[PDB]
Write a protein that binds this ligand. Sequence first.
Ligand code: NAG
Ligand code: NAG
Ligand code: XXH
Ligand code: XXH
Ligand code: EAC
Ligand code: EAC
Lengths: 269, 269
Amino acid sequence: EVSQDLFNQFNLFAQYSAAAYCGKNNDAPAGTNITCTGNACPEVEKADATFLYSFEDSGVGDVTGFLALDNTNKLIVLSFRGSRSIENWIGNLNFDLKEINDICSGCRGHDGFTSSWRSVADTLRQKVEDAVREHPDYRVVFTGHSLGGALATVAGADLRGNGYDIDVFSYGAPRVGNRAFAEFLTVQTGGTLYRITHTNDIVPRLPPREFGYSHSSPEYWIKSGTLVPVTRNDIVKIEGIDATGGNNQPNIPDIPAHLWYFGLIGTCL
Amino acid sequence: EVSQDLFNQFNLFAQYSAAAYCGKNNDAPAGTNITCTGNACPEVEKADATFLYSFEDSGVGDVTGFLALDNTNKLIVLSFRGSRSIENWIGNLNFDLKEINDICSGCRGHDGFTSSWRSVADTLRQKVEDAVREHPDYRVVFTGHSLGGALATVAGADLRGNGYDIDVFSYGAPRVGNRAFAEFLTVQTGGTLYRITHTNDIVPRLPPREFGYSHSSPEYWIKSGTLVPVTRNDIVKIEGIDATGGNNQPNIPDIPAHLWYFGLIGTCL
Ligand SMILES: *[C@@H]1O[C@H](CO)[C@@H](O)[C@H](O)[C@H]1NC(C)=O
Ligand SMILES: *[C@@H]1O[C@H](CO)[C@@H](O)[C@H](O)[C@H]1NC(C)=O
Ligand SMILES: O=Cc1ccc([N+](=O)[O-])cc1
Ligand SMILES: O=Cc1ccc([N+](=O)[O-])cc1
Ligand SMILES: CCOC(=O)CC(C)=O
Ligand SMILES: CCOC(=O)CC(C)=O
């Protein structure tokens, strides 16, 4: 059981994370309303939310996502889409840890995520600041599903410190880094990382701890099943780096559980 | 507000329609438990439910589906899959009538449906009759979603009046034939047709009716949104051939609403 308010935020950013796949903005100009196909993001449509910047297949990693102003909730939101085909993207996933000391002292992190962010990091950083300046009063939030979780977590760990909190809401994110990097995220200040996982979603179970990866604490763990609605009572905060009895159990994982975070995500009806 | 029990029947049959797509049926051995991926058919899995006869790409409209034995609910259930990819099925939808006076005289139903049915119709009626025999007190139900709903609602009228009732539960069914057809379906005894609709589903609005199609009465019409759970007070009974106030209304149709009948249907997580 989490608090209602936190349960609301988790839903909200789950729907901003879903809008990265199902909003209509392939080339949608800055200022237009954020709407989705398939009722993927109704809490968003109900706010006065608009794009500040849409992006797609950008830089080295072919990153995709958008920047939203939310007047109703007073947020600036950076939402990163996961992979367009999660099953293949799971299958082509290398386990290669890299040196991350530009971010932190002795932090190992996965090579492709660290890589993709840097490629776009400057062009987007510039674009948060501009809005953070324009609406100094609004909470910055980075969020994302799946790959998107990874990206978001890494941009957040990377752009904090500059005098405005960045909160991160991740959904079914993969492990990002080595136990020190984990540690850096568990303890880092300038914001909170909210690491959300569902049941035996598999993506969070990768890469394996037996390739040295760890999970930043803490974990918010959705127990209710696939296709089941979520209530504040089905979420468990699990304390402790690489803890177990959350998602991190030695039962068999599942891919459907990964596309069910407070509703459909990773896909579009 | 439908009754609790009819509601339970709606759900269960929705789930048998969903199992057409998401079951591990392929051609599995008869007597295997029925199970689905993606939490798609839990009420089926809860029941002592086992395949009797599987089929894949059978006859002259690659009809796919299964025949099931459910000792818990006392059912013999024939469930026909709709199209493997629907939007592509909708696009190439041929609007050609044909005559099937061997069902009702002066009746003309969609050539493509009747034609795929007839081609497999024997082999199945045998398989059903077989199963009615070893389980005489079991209720025979035909079910389906979308073009599976078509086949079920046709294999219906054709196989009725041979001693045994045949209920038909259809979910987002297209029109299947001419107004002569509507009445025969609307009045026919020894089995009642529960034609279920959601919001603006597209598949039920085709064919248009200016190709010469009408709709049987009554209509059961789910008024709750896409990705919203259905309660009893979200279902509305709708009467009169081709009446309106349900799916059949003048607004824009949606593909997504077609994929949400009590849960996810027409697609597998
Ligand atoms: C955008 O939404 C605002 C308020 O949230 C609304 O007033 C306006 O009509 C919308 N624009 C369009 C094109 O719907
Ligand atoms: C099939 O289900 C029955 C009861 O519904 C159960 O007793 C049996 O264990 C199941 N078979 C398998 C292989 O799970
Ligand atoms: O976050 C995914 C999601 C799925 C369905 C819905 N919904 O429409 O309720 C919202 C969000
Ligand atoms: O899956 C539960 C269930 C409950 C009632 C019925 N019925 O009464 O038809 C069928 C299934
Ligand atoms: C092969 C999976 O497709 C993609 O990678 C798309 C993406 C990275 O967003
Ligand atoms: C559009 C109908 O869907 C199909 O079954 C096409 C196929 C892969 O054989």
